[PDB]
């Protein structure tokens, strides 16, 4: 089915009667307002652009204002597109969004992962540090060999070396949907979704399930 | 890494940072306007403003706490006598930072940090 956009508002535990302490991530999946639907004639793909949240309309640009003005002038924080296989959706917004996530049992969550800076090799990959004390002149966490002498004479394109980690899209699949609360627009999903609290999130029904 | 972390090191150890901000708070209380570098003024807000917030209520325990965090009895007397009533109505924001130009010896962002109800 079509996914929805929510804002991550934190991690808690839910305590069942047996006492299993399910780690829930609550997501504020507010009502998603369609801004565009694409027909097969105009574009090759059939999809809905959706917006959520509020934007003040001081910071709304007039191109975005005209795009908002078509299909009902309500500014949101962003536009995200979900491709549809079969189901037809209007250009106006749906009233409640988590009602479609009521039936689904496992979900996939996409988010920008937290920025980890210029991570080293030991952090970025799981490199094993060399021995601390016996000798080891100034080479404790440095990358060791990166290539294999004259015959390659170069280091390959896929080489595991230090760089920026985080600030990247990562999807976690097959997360159990613990609770759907329509009134607060809240979706409680088992486990840990990517990103910091307050970051944007893409919630989709499970491709695996 | 630095996530949700307060505190500016300013390339000095914790004892020097504490001593430096004690002396800077004493100078700011004494003259009511000082010129510092801009991050120094910005953390000077964080040391100086709770002193006046403590100094709103005058008691022997509060004067002793202000003496603990300043070690200058003249500054304690000024905080609990001259200032304090002046900033009693003010709900925070006793400090105003006005950015000046750049220092001569090192190109450092310079600022004047001042008390808001300055007599001058």
């Amino acid at each position: 089915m079509i996914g929805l956009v929510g804002k991550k508002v934190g991690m808690t535990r839910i305590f069942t009667e047996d006492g299993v302490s399910i780690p829930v991530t609550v997501i504020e999946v507010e009502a998603n307002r369609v801004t565009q639907v694409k027909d097969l004639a105009n574009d090759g793909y059939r999809a809905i652009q959706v917006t959520t949240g509020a934007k003040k309309a001081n910071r709304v640009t007039k191109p975005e204002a005209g795009h908002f003005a078509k299909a009902g002038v309500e500014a949101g924080r962003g536009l995200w597109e979900f491709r549809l296989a079969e189901g037809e959706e209007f250009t106006v917004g749906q009233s409640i969004s988590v009602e479609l996530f009521a039936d689904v049992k496992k979900v996939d969550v996409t988010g920008t992962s937290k920025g980890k800076g210029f991570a080293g090799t030991v952090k970025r990959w799981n490199f094993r540090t060399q021995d601390a004390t016996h000798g080891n002149s100034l080479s404790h966490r440095v990358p060791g060999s990166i290539g294999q002498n004259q015959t390659p004479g170069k280091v390959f394109k896929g080489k595991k070396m230090a760089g920026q980690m985080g600030n990247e899209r990562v999807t976690v699949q097959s997360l159990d949907v613990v609770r759907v609360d329509a009134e607060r627009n809240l979706l409680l999903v088992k486990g840990a979704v990517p990103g910091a609290t307050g970051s944007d999130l893409i919630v989709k029904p499970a491709v695996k399930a | 890494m630095r996530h949700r972390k307060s505190g500016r090191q300013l390339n000095r150890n914790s004892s020097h940072r504490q001593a430096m901000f004690r002396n800077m708070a004493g100078s700011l209380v004494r003259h009511e306007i000082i010129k510092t570098t801009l991050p120094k003024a910005k953390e000077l807000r964080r040391v100086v403003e709770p002193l006046i917030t403590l100094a709103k209520t005058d008691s022997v325990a509060n004067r002793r706490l202000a003496f603990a965090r300043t070690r200058d009895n003249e500054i304690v007397a000024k905080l609990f006598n001259e200032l304090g009533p002046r900033f009693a109505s003010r709900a925070g924001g006793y400090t105003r930072i006005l950015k000046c130009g750049f220092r001569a010896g090192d190109n450092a962002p310079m600022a004047y940090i001042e008390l808001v109800d300055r007599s001058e």
């Binding site: 508002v9 808690t12 535990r13 839910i14 305590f15 006492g19 609550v26 607060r184 809240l186 | -």
Partner: protein
């Protein structure tokens, strides 16, 4: 935020007793071995922490037979059913790790509104 922890306030148990660290408490924990469910008593000196919301816990140490067993108990968990305060201990710290690790160390009882 406020949208979170209203759910915590929904799940927090309202029957939690009040005890200082040092008190020798008894916790009755449900155990579901099969269809049958039975309460189990765990009594020992408290090394706890103040209520962090739904996420609250107590550590209790008992010498069962030659072995010092420490159990951390989730306060608002449904498995924790009843905590009885029993003996009250007067001690000058919140965390009693050093006092509990010593063998033959017995905390005093003081009843002076404390």
């Amino acid at each position: 935020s406020n949208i979170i922890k209203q759910l915590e306030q929904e799940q927090m148990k309202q029957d939690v007793p009040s005890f200082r660290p040092g008190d020798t408490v008894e916790v009755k924990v449900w155990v579901v071995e099969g269809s049958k469910k039975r309460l189990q008593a765990f009594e020992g000196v408290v090394i706890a922490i103040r209520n962090r919301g739904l996420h609250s816990a107590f550590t209790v140490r008992k010498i069962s037979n030659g072995e010092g067993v420490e159990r951390v108990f989730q306060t608002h968990s449904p498995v924790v059913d009843s905590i009885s305060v029993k003996r009250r201990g007067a001690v000058r710290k919140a965390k009693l790790y050093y006092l509990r690790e010593r063998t033959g160390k017995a905390a005093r009882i003081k009843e002076r509104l404390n």
